[PDB]
């Protein structure tokens, strides 16, 4: 099928269900692509995918989703090259394909069954901006009958926190929210910080939403912990040394310019909550190896 | 002047004869006084030992009573904390937190109560809100209301507390109840199944029991 159908189901997906991100939609987009073929060599194969994965990376500009078709095109194949039928190995690929997304979907109860445990009795969690993954934790945290108290931030330019601090107050949990530049005058109050992430990197830092490293270099001046929450189909192949490494097609949206994300260094960070297990800075060298296979 | 009794003595087989002989010794202080009168011949000797990195006592009255669970709450004989669990039940276990706070399983509280030390709550006990609890122990299976104010008192299994209460330095038995707007002054005892009613205010000393007031009214 063309690109038009592409863009259509993509669009399609992303809008039938709220409650997902864009990764899961590019690889049951690529899926569905992957059924719909009819060639007979393999290479023609995997440069028809090639060029699909280039054409949807153009609509959404999000680190996850070329991490995610790189590593979807990299697992799909790691036996299917034996018989001589395209029939035997393409239902083997799609096969693999299905089991994939099966083992995608059960990351995030994993997360949270880790992360519940380190919350105290009678706290004061800060946060910023708006993530599901760190609602759920909340959410089970409160399922073991704990109590603590939330700070939030409006996380301009889009009020992101407010959507947030609305999901929390259905749940009954004591939530306030506080201006962008009064970071460090709340941060006397605060016991531990958790965020989310947009993807991580070789040398252990993080790139997420603007306003990341300045909240981060607050906690470090005051010795508080640094918590961070992300998936496996997140880690990316990029080693930056400062913020003006990060590639331009990330930065900006499709200084006046206000660019939408920011990198975190591995020094300001104390643990790592992964689908993976608990690890460290230092482990996730190692693990991005052993992951792309 | 300064030693302190345990009520434990290490005796002889001997001992079982001079309780024989003499038909009108009946506790251990005759014994002790005609042995130190009686100077003539026999068995005549008594040692004391003395020691000074240990703990003994004996519960004889409701005074050395609450001294008594007071210092047991706070560690002092420990080889033995609630922790430590030495009955080997399946029903009496808890976690230790700061300031001398143990919790059982299961208990749920409230929104803005708070437990200032040495508090010991057991399974099923129920906590409402705005509630104010220090050295105090609480039964296993209790339901407490709200805006309810506990201190150095001891409450027993399946006693139920309404909302509106203050309560100071008492003991309540078993499957007792107390109403709203009541206020005990200290050293006030409840007997089983004894219920008071809503409005009142006892005086020090009062003393509640469902048996005969004084041995069909």
């Given at each position: 099928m063309d690109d038009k159908e592409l863009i259509e189901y993509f669009k399609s997906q992303m809008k039938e269900d709220?409650?997902?991100?864009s990764a899961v939609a590019a690889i049951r987009t690529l899926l569905e692509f992957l059924k719909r073929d009819k060639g007979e060599t393999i290479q023609g194969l995997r440069a028809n995918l090639t060029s699909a994965i280039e054409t949807l990376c153009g609509v959404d500009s999000s680190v996850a989703v070329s991490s995610g078709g790189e590593l979807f095109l990299r697992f799909?194949?790691?036996?299917?090259?034996?018989?001589?039928?395209?029939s035997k190995c393409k239902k083997i690929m799609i096969e693999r394909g299905e089991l994939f997304l099966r083992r995608i979907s059960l990351s995030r109860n994993k997360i949270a069954d880790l992360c519940h445990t380190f919350i105290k009795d009678g706290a004061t969690i800060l946060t910023h901006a708006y993530s599901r993954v760190v609602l759920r934790v909340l959410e089970a945290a409160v399922a073991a009958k704990k109590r603590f108290s939330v700070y939030v931030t409006?996380?301009?330019?889009?009020?992101?926190?407010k959507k947030m601090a609305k999901a929390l107050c259905h749940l009954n949990v004591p939530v306030t929210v506080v201006l962008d530049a009064a970071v460090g005058y709340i941060?006397?109050?605060?016991?531990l910080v958790i965020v989310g992430a947009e993807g991580v990197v070789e040398n252990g830092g993080i790139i997420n939403k603007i306003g990341t490293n300045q909240m981060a270099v607050c906690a470090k001046a005051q010795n508080k912990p640094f918590y961070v929450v992300a998936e496996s189909f997140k880690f990316v192949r990029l080693f930056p040394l400062?913020?003006?490494?990060?590639?331009?097609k990330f930065k900006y949206?499709?200084?006046?310019?206000?660019?939408w994300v920011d990198y975190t260094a591995?020094?300001?960070?104390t643990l790592l909550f992964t689908d993976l297990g608990v690890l460290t800075p230092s482990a996730v060298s190692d693990e991005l190896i052993k992951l792309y296979l | 002047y300064d030693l302190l009794d345990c009520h434990i003595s290490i005796c002889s087989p001997q001992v079982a004869q001079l309780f024989t002989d003499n038909f009108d010794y009946q506790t251990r202080d005759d014994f002790v006084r005609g042995l130190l009168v009686n100077?003539?011949?026999?068995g005549n000797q008594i040692h004391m030992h003395v020691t000074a990195k240990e703990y003994g006592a004996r519960v004889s009255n409701l005074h050395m009573y609450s001294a008594v669970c007071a210092d047991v709450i706070r560690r002092?004989?420990?080889?033995?904390?609630?922790?430590?669990?030495?009955?080997?039940?399946?029903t009496q276990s808890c976690t230790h937190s700061r300031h001398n706070i143990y919790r059982g399983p299961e208990v749920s509280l409230g929104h803005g109560s708070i437990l200032e030390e040495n508090v010991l709550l057991g399974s099923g006990t129920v906590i409402g809100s705005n509630c104010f609890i220090t050295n105090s122990v609480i039964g296993p299976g209790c339901h407490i209301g709200d805006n309810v104010v506990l201190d150095q008192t001891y409450l027993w299994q399946g006693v139920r507390v309404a909302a509106g209460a203050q309560i100071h330095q008492s003991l309540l038995c078993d499957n007792a109840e107390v109403k709203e707007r009541v206020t005990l002054k200290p050293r006030s005892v409840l007997t089983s199944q004894v219920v008071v009613g809503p409005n009142i205010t006892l005086p020090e000393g009062s003393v509640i029991s469902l048996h005969p007031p004084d041995a069909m009214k």
């Open positions: 709220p409650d997902m991100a799909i194949s790691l036996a299917s090259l034996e018989y001589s039928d395209y409006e996380s301009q330019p889009d009020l992101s926190g941060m006397e109050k605060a016991d400062n913020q003006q490494d990060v590639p331009d949206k499709a200084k006046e310019e206000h660019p591995p020094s300001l960070i | 100077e003539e011949i026999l002092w004989v420990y080889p033995l904390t609630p922790e430590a669990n030495f009955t080997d039940s399946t």
